[PDB]
Design a protein around this nucleic acid. Structure first.
Lengths: 62, 140, 206, 8, 72, 142, 84, 59, 141, 100
RNA sequence: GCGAUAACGAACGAGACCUUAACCUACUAAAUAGUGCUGCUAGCAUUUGCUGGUAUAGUCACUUCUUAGAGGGACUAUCGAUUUCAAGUCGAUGGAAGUUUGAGGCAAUAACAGGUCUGUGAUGCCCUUAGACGUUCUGGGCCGCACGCGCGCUACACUGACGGAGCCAGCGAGUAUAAGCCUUGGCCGAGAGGUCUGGGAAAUCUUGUGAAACUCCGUCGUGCUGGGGAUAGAGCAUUGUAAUUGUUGCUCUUCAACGAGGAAUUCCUAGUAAGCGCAAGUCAUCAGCUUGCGUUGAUUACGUCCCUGCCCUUUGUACACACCG
């Protein structure tokens, strides 16, 4: 039940310490439903990082 | 004299001077055969410049290297660099340039340190600490 | 394939290395493939090397670590806990013996088992902290492929170290047992317990 | 800081 | 304080060794200690004799690590 | 080569009124014997011709008595004087090597012999302080 | 050994001569403002690119103070300070 | 960073305004021209001003 | 081809010259070999009591073969190591002078060495002869 | 003919190289065979003191240096010629030693 | 710096600058550096080969390595992206070097009741000045021990201990009629050390400072064990006019806590951290200390202002000796 989502744009650094990044993902199969999600490690564009759950957006962290 | 080229390879401080003369397939380390270079587990680092192109390239050349300075590992990298550079300088000077550019192509595509000495050197120590960047533990 | 006779005799196996570059002139990279699309670009096994000791410059730029061989990253991560810093020749010796033991045990490709254990050991969702100046707070965030790989290597070497600490069992075969078990997905192994506990807390934090 | 007192 | 590894080799243990070590995928000093309850030194001498007796083939030779296998 | 035995092993040995574990190698079992360090036990074993590849219980009674004989008569077995524990003794001036009970006996006699003359070292022994000049400002906290 | 005595060509450009003259004036009772501006102007009259005079100590007051008397253009950091 | 300073930026723009026809897009030709035009006490400052005037000529 | 000392691994060349020199038996062994420590930095005598002197003489002979007029102070420095000072840091300490001087003297009266000009001790005309012999009977297996 | 060695020492290299080149020039135009100059490895006399005269403050250190440069030139010429060369190219900064 | 702009054009500081490291088969030379040849010479196979030794006259050659002076070389160079298309940033390509190319030295306008009169034949004033607070001689103290704290070194083992064997640096220092320097070598001695000669005022000799980690082969086998080496007993030498309240070194013996460390807290972005030693300073002796140097050599960001420190703007002031108001 995992969905794979290629990242297409690195939005910017979020989180209190700046250790997590907002990113815009695109699914490898069914190339639509582009989502903004947060990722912990360093990220370039064209990363195939996989998502355990897909139906959740992300917003700014306090 | 004869077809002789003399080169050197370098690591941090180690420098190995390679003499490449026309002769038989003689490959010696400080007057000793290459089959017993130490450490044993890193013998394939110096085996890389030989087996990558093929030993047939060494029919016409004999190599005698002199490695001094540095440490054990830095000397291993200095010898393998001296071997690779001596072979390259001989090809550049006494054989067609097609072979010299092929050798340089395989060498660069495999390991940059085979021909170009690494420029990293030890940072000097600065006062106020036991190392270059390390500082004495501070207390309040 | 022909044996080339030199005045300085060259052993048969290393002269056999002219055909193919193999790890320790024994293990081939040709038939090894990563069973995960997401870590192909960050586990570098495409360029074979003879010995896991290259002394390259992989700390200059940001993503230079992805170009160093994954086995060399493992032997780099092995030399930890103070007393082992700088003992790289010891780390390469231990790794070389670990691959031989992983081959002799279960009869598989040693680097296939290492690659399987690394793709299988990295947590896919980690719960980052969003604590407001001291208070306990956790938020589930995704983990980049690079951090998944190098956290897999961190947990694999930590587990082998702790299984080999104050134990007659040698480090090479503690590493061999941890890598084989994580390769086959056994929950008994460390770095698989850690991965499961990480993804469990991340499921219990989103 | 001290007053030298003699004995002899 | 649970090790209590055997340091004296009797005949019952000797033939238990010759009956059990062959049915192993991989034997070594630590494997012998772990499962045969013999000491490390006895494991090393057991390996050095079992190789002379042909039961065991040396996969790899090293002072700190001895990787051995069955010869059958 | 590996050899086997039955019923000859002795789990506990008794030398100089001290119980010795029979499955320890001879050099370090004698190092268990007080007054016998590793350096001394290797030499008493080489003078007694007991090859070090034998366990303590492997050793026979004849060898154990030959060892206690050498330890009790060191000068008689070509053991150099400078290698001994108690050389140039205070009272009789001869070279000695003290053993299990004699070591603490003559050590005691040395403590009282300094305290009777009320030497500074004997005084500090009486007080329980360090005698070799060590600082006690910050480490004498036991 | 042979000793020869040569007059310094540019007294205004020699800080040693200017310092000895200032000392002989302060010890002769000349006011600090007049002496400092007398060397600021002697240096500029001699052609100095810049000049700065600092006088520190205690002067007719229990508390001590320092006064700087700068002039013209002055550099502070690097080799040219070792050169010019 | 590689941020050019005022002393090199203004010097390069003065070169652009004072020797425009003689300048070209080649760094080495620009460098030699600046050496034979302006007095620079160090080759490092010389190369730096040559690079900035090269970028200006590019623009 | 002419086999030399440089063409053979050091560990089994020394084990082979030591084995030959022991079976030949003419090397004189001093009477204190079972008592003494090799270095002041060591804490125990060598574990190979019967053969360590022979092996060390073989190592000294090979080392002098590959080098030129090495002295005995340099041989002490060569075989010396880090001392296990209790709480103080490690330090390099030389090997025993008497042991090294006796070893080199034994090789000098067995015929492998002689006093070389401008110091040191060269290898003999036959010292090279018999080292090259051991090397040949070393590498046939 | 006379085998004569000239040793050049100074702290600053400009005058040392000026004297060295001037002597080589005169030993060139005079048909005197010469060997040199040989640049001996310079010795860096380094002294690292504490800046603070007392013992208060951050532990900051100066690192003073004194480079000593040595050149040797071998000449085959009569002693009168070499000595008058020394007096032609005598310099306060550079010291000269003559050895047979 | 771009840009916006009642501002325009400038100065100090930053940056530039200087020293050092990395490149030079491109010049200039080098018996205080190396090499190839050549004499003479040795061993093994005899193939003419492979390793050596020797040559301050073979009165050879050369400068790749070694040394050092004049220079050259990088300026973000070229090409892709983003950007106000600007300053810039991120990727590649070439390169020895593309993090200010790495590291340092110097470093503004004012100031602090910051530290030193225990560095000064630097100082004002006060005190003492012959039974001296001057100077010198003798012995003790600065080490003193119910305790709290800081900078560290060894360790808690097997990625290890011992035992043999392999065997690689760089920074430096070194004397004379002294008052004793670095010391090769030979001969004694288990060691420490002793004795006799010689070299070096030094790219020449110590010195290839043959350093330690490191690698190989063996014993040990999870045990407060062969981990650890305090504490303590006896002895042997060195330094010093004098070692006791141990200078240090060496031999035997004694076999302690410590089995990875609470609350808290330090340093750290590349040849860096961490290990590992070596030299110089103090120095008759003593380095668990600093100042440097080199061996092995990483993990993880390459981001943020969440904590902590500092700076700026707005703002409030009954402060200006400026909140110690």
């Amino acid at each position: 039940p995992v969905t794979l989502a290629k990242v297409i744009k690195v939005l910017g650094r979020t989180g209190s310490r700046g250790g997590v990044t907002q990113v815009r993902v695109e699914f490898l199969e069914d190339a639509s439903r582009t989502i903004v999600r947060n990722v912990k490690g360093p990220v370039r564009e064209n990363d195939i990082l996989c998502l355990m759950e897909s139906e959740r957006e992300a917003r700014r962290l306090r | 004299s004869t077809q002789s080229v003399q080169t050197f390879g370098k690591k941090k401080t180690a420098t190995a001077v390679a003499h490449v003369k026309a002769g038989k397939g003689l490959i010696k380390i400080n007057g000793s055969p290459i089959t017993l270079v130490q450490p044993e587990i890193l013998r394939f680092k110096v085996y890389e410049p030989l087996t990558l192109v093929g030993l047939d390239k060494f029919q016409g050349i004999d190599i005698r290297v002199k490695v001094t300075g540095g440490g054990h590992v830095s000397q291993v990298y200095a010898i393998r660099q001296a071997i690779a550079k001596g072979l390259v300088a001989y090809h550049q000077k006494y054989v067609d340039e097609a072979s010299k550019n092929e050798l340089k192509k395989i060498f660069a595509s495999y390991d940059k340190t085979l021909l170009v000495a690494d420029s990293r050197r030890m940072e000097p120590k600065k006062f106020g600490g036991r190392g270059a960047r390390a500082r004495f533990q501070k207390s309040y | 394939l022909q044996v080339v006779e030199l005045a300085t005799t060259i052993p048969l196996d290393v002269q056999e290395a002219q055909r193919e570059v193999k790890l320790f002139n024994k293990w081939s990279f040709e038939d090894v493939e990563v069973k995960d699309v997401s870590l192909v670009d960050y586990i570098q096994i495409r360029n074979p090397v003879f010995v896991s000791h290259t002394a390259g410059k992989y700390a200059s730029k940001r993503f230079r670590k992805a170009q160093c061989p994954i086995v060399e990253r493992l032997t780099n991560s092995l030399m930890m806990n103070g007393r082992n810093n700088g003992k790289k020749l010891k780390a390469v010796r231990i790794v070389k013996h670990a691959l031989e033991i992983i081959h002799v045990l279960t009869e598989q490709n040693p680097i296939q088992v290492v690659v399987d254990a690394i793709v299988n050991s990295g947590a896919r969702e980690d719960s980052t902290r969003i604590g407001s100046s001291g208070t306990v707070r956790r938020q589930a965030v995704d983990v980049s492929p690079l951090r998944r790989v190098n956290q897999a290597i961190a947990l694999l070497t930590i587990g082998a170290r702790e299984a080999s600490f104050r134990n007659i069992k040698t480090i090479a075969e503690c590493l061999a047992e941890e890598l084989i078990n994580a390769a086959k997905g056994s929950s008994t192994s460390y770095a698989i317990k850690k991965k499961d506990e990480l993804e469990r807390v991340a499921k219990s934090n989103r | 800081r001290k007053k030298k007192v003699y004995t002899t | 304080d649970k090790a209590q590894h055997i340091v004296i080799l009797d005949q019952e243990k000797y033939d238990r060794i010759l009956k059990d070590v062959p049915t192993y995928k991989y034997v070594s000093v630590s494997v012998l200690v772990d499962r045969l309850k013999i000491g490390g030194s006895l494991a090393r001498v057991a390996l050095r004799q079992l190789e002379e007796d042909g039961i065991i083939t040396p996969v790899l030779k090293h002072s700190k690590q001895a990787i051995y296998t069955r010869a059958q | 080569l590996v050899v086997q035995e039955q019923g000859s092993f002795q789990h506990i040995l008794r030398l100089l009124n001290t119980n010795i574990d029979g499955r320890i190698k001879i050099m370090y079992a004698l190092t268990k014997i007080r007054g016998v360090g590793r350096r001394y036990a290797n030499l008493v074993c080489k003078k007694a011709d007991v090859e070090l590849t034998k366990r303590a219980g492997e050793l026979t009674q004849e060898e154990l008595e030959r060892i206690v004989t050498i330890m009790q008569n060191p000068t008689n077995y070509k053991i150099p004087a400078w290698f001994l524990n108690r050389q140039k003794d205070q009272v009789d001036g001869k070279d000695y090597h003290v053993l299990a009970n004699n070591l603490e006996s003559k050590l005691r006699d040395d403590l009282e012999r300094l305290k009777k003359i009320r030497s500074h070292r004997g005084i500090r022994h009486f007080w329980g302080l360090k005698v070799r000049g060590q600082h006690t400002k910050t480490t004498s906290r036991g | 050994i042979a000793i020869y005595a040569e007059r310094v060509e540019e007294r205004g450009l020699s800080a040693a001569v200017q310092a000895e003259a200032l000392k002989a004036k302060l010890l002769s009772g000349l006011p600090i403002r007049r002496a400092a501006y007398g060397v600021l102007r002697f240096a500029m009259g001699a052609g100095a690119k810049g000049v700065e005079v600092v006088i520190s100590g205690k002067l007719r007051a229990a508390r001590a103070k320092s006064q700087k008397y700068a002039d013209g253009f002055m550099i502070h950091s690097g080799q040219p300070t070792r050169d010019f | 960073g590689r941020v050019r300073t005022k002393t090199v930026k203004r010097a390069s723009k003065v070169l652009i305004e004072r020797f425009y026809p003689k300048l070209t897009l080649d760094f080495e030709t620009n460098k030699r021209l600046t050496s034979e035009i302006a007095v620079i006490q160090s080759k490092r400052l010389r190369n730096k001003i040559a690079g900035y005037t090269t970028h200006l000529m590019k623009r | 081809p002419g086999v030399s000392v440089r063409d053979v691994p050091a560990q089994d060349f020394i084990n082979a010259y030591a084995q030959f020199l022991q079976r030949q038996g003419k090397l004189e062994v001093p009477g204190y070999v079972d008592i003494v420590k090799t270095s002041a930095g060591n804490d125990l005598p060598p574990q190979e009591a019967e053969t360590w002197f022979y092996k060390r003489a073989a190592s000294i002979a090979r080392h002098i073969y590959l080098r030129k007029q090495v002295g005995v102070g340099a041989l002490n420095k060569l075989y010396g190591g880090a001392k296990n000072r209790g709480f103080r840091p490690h330090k390099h300490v030389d090997a025993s002078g008497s042991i090294n001087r006796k070893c080199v003297q034994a090789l000098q009266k067995i015929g492998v060495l002689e006093i070389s000009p401008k110091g040191g001790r060269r290898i003999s005309e036959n010292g090279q002869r018999d080292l090259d012999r051991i090397a040949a009977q070393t590498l046939e297996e | 003919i006379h085998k004569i060695r000239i040793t050049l020492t100074s702290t600053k290299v400009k005058q040392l190289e000026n004297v060295s080149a001037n002597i080589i020039r005169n030993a060139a135009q005079y048909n005197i065979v010469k060997k040199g100059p040989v640049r001996m490895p310079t010795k860096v006399l380094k002294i690292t003191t504490r800046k603070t005269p007392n013992g208060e403050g951050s532990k900051t250190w100066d690192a003073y240096e004194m480079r000593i440069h040595k050149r040797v030139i071998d000449l085959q010429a009569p002693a009168s010629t070499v000595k008058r060369i020394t007096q032609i190219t005598i310099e306060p900064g550079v010291d000269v030693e003559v050895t047979i």
